[model samples]
Target: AQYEDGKQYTTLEKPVAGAPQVLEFFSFFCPHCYQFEEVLHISDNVKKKLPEGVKMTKYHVNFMGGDLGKDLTQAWAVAMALGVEDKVTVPLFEGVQKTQTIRSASDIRDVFINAGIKGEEYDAAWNSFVVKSLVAQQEKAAADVQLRGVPAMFVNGKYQLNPQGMDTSNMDVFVQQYADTVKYLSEK
Candidate 1:
């Protein structure tokens, strides 16, 4: 699958450096993003295939702007701060999309506790200054990209996979195309 500027993906005016960054902009409240988690999670096959030195990060989109959005965003930031994103990411998605067990920040904290994270550990990470800073940075980054919806992907902070242009009928093809685009950009 060939990526065309302004079609399959868009080019950023100024790209971030150091390493190729593959970012998945998502929201736990988004059903489509929840579905995409099957491919985008840390332990997933697609993630495993990422080229060496390519950094993959998931940014929770907070566009929904309700308690649910704020809670999930904070939950993701806390998990990232404590380096337990892999532990919490999938379950978080399930908690919201499948089980529907998460309704607020307290519920989100409970999910972490049930996952074996000690209360102190959860509190430290959840209320940490680092988590708060990261949340702010992620929100700014999402705004910088002018993100229109969830499950949007960006490579090296430059090329954004065009969600509107995607063919959702065959998600396998869409996933492969995304992988190919990442591989192609990562090599550049």
Candidate 2:
């Protein structure tokens, strides 16, 4: 009851709950998302401040970066399945948005290779049923939320965090407020 509706956050059309947590809908091609992750380091900061047993889920939308979007989403799924997201996520972001080196699926695979993940292991995970299913579910989630932006965050999957309503006086303040809002909603 502490967080205000339509200001701090908006009620979802179809409420979702995932062990009571946070979910972010974002794209590799999104400049704003790059800023949020690379510049602000918001997600990592928010996670550090969140209470124990709570976590965040990042969903890569399969609707951006043209034909490569689907491939990138698939790659992201594979990385997650292999628990190599730590090795690949930021590199992939830098690959696409900064260096513009990732033009094909093979190029994405190369990034994994540089991360020291063996080609055979990555190939196996890429073709696995689990990664494929994760890709499919990620596509569905992008559509299910009727997503309208590159970096949308939902708390407890029931409240959409409104950036316009958060304090923007400074980066530290903004992030703390953002984390505070997420903390409040996650506990609901």
Candidate 3:
């Protein structure tokens, strides 16, 4: 009977405790997710608009390529660990969706190598306990929503945005509304 509760967002059964967080579950092979990262610049835009101390976390879901999707998810965590996500995320998206060049785990690693990240560093981070735990934790985070699609956004791990309720007719309005809704949910 209200926009805030059901129309705009749905409250989680078990709210995640701790710092305020905005969790995004995306897949490299998803075109819309690619566009969100590439054409729309949603990550950076949303980051700038978020309230202080509110963290925006991204999870690369394993819904795209079966085994390869899992590899990409792990690789994504590795990229974040090595601090090369900004360098390789876009290329990975383009390679997967546009060029069809990323077909295996090694292909994903090659992208890291091209970005000035040492292969040893990549292997090290990929095998490290922390990176492994991060990947598992991200996957478990996605399990919170039992995602139906990519580019899923959840705030505070306690709410999922109502996608159909948003006005996506224009990028400006959509992004603005996203930031506003995220802020609202974060404060909840």
Candidate 4:
């Protein structure tokens, strides 16, 4: 079904440059965002379903407050800068939600180490200027979007979707609906 603006998503005042930019705003400490991992199989499906030329990005939201929240946001920026998100994404979420083992930068580093990343390599990315800049950019973007909560999605920078806002009994059906909405927006 096509997503109606008032029902399924909202349109932005100015569409962000690059039509088809899919951005998922999330936080490690957000239980709902963590639950989304299983409900949507988001990690796997995103890559498989996004149309060609559609730019997909995930932003680590920092509204949770506290040092840990900031650390995870920085860690995500670091991983993205290092091009290691494919290796660290799921484990990072699991480490925080399931194992409850991640507390600081060192804990985040351990997840990468366990994933086979060299200590020096991880350290370099963790402390890189690129990571610092990206973290700032993400923060600015989050503010620009006036983010309300975790696990929110933006399509082509024009449409916003909060899966929880949609009423549905079947999660799989919801996933399909979300994917279809994205595909439709991306092509528009």
lDDT of 3 at 137: 83
Kindly report which residue stretches of model 1 are placed more than 4 angstroms away from their true locations once superposed: 13-20, 39-45, 163-169
Tens digit of per-residue lDDT, candidate 2, span 1-188: 56789888788988764423678888889988888887788798889888998767888887788789888898989887888878887888999999999999999999999999999999999999999899987877767677878788877767888888987779888888888888877777
Model 3 Cα displacement at 61 (Å)? 1.1
Q: Which pairs in model 4 have colliding backbones?
A: none
Q: Show pairs that collide, candidate 2.
A: none
Worst 10 residues of 2 by lDDT: 15-24
What is the C-alpha lDDT profile of model 1 across 1-188, one tens digit per residue? 46678876778776655423777788888887767776543225446667776667778888874778987888888888878876787788888888988877888998888888999999988788899998997888887777878777778777767656767687677677666666776666
Using TM-score, rank the candidates from best to worst.
2, 3, 4, 1
C-alpha lDDT of candidate 4 relative to the true structure? 0.78
Error of 2 at 77 (Å): 0.4
Model 4, range 1-188, lDDT digits (tens) per residue?
A: 44677666778886666533888888888887877775576645665777777667888988884788899899889888878887887898888888988877798899989988899988888888988998997897787777878777788678876465565788778777777666776676
Q: Candidate 3 local accuracy as lDDT?
A: 0.82
Steric collisions counted per model: 0, 0, 0, 0
Q: What is the TM-score of each candidate against the true structure?
A: 0.85, 0.91, 0.91, 0.88
The per-model lDDT (C-alpha) reads 0.75, 0.84, 0.82, 0.78
Q: Which of the numbered candidates is closest to the native, going by highest lDDT?
A: 2
